[PDB]
């Protein structure tokens, strides 16, 4: 039983980052965490089992893992240790991840573009783009 979200499945390694420090400032991440998180070169491991999608990240900074069903809110601990309420949906082929905490919101979009997985993170008007390639 294939699904469209199978284009995301696999092991991905970070190959470029743009404006991540500024995005983290807008989110409210402190200096020391920004510096060490910004240095990280995570791998992201995406898998699907039935209706459950898992996204795991492994890095020298932190390892994180989320499992979820599309459209069903869950509580998430982020790499920077926010406790957030998250919902992830598929909108036209893009995984759209909204995180809410403390009256604030940020959106992380994940899309396949050529052989890359492109992650766009937006907090108010600030966008960071993080590009992954297959490991």
Ligand X SMILES: O=C(N[C@H]1C[C@H](Oc2ccccc2)CC[C@H]1C(=O)O)c1cccc(Cl)c1
Chain residues in the site for ligand X (CB under 6 A): 24, 27, 29, 37, 40, 42, 44, 57, 59, 61-62, 64, 78-80, 108, 119, 121, 130
CB of 3 to ligand X, least distance (A): 21
CB of 9 to ligand X, least distance (A): 15
Residue 45 bridge partners (DSSP): 11, 56
Query: Is 112 annotated as ligand-binding?
Result: no
Query: Is 134 annotated as ligand-binding?
Result: no
- CA-to-CA distance for 9 and 12, rounded, in angstroms? 9
Query: Is 130 annotated as ligand-binding?
Result: yes
* Cβ atoms of 66 and 79 closer than 8 Å: no
The pair of structure tokens assigned to 119 is: 């992650």
CB of 86 to ligand X, least distance (A): 11
- CA-to-CA distance for 112 and 54, rounded, in angstroms? 17
Annotated binding site for a fatty acid: 130-132
């Amino acid at each position: 039983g294939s699904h469209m979200c199978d284009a995301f499945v696999g092991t991905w390694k970070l190959v470029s980052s743009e404006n991540f420090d500024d995005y983290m400032k807008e989110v409210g991440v402190g200096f020391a965490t920004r510096k060490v998180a910004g240095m990280a070169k995570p791998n992201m491991i995406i898998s699907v089992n039935g209706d459950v999608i898992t996204i795991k990240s492994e890095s020298t900074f932190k390892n994180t893992e989320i499992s979820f069903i599309l459209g069903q809110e869950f509580d998430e601990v982020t790499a920077d240790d926010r406790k957030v309420k998250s919902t992830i949906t598929l909108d036209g082929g893009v995984l759209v991840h909204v995180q809410k905490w403390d009256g604030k919101s940020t959106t992380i979009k994940r899309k396949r573009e050529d052989d890359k997985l492109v992650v766009e993170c937006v907090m108010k008007g600030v966008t960071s783009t993080r590009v992954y390639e297959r490991a």
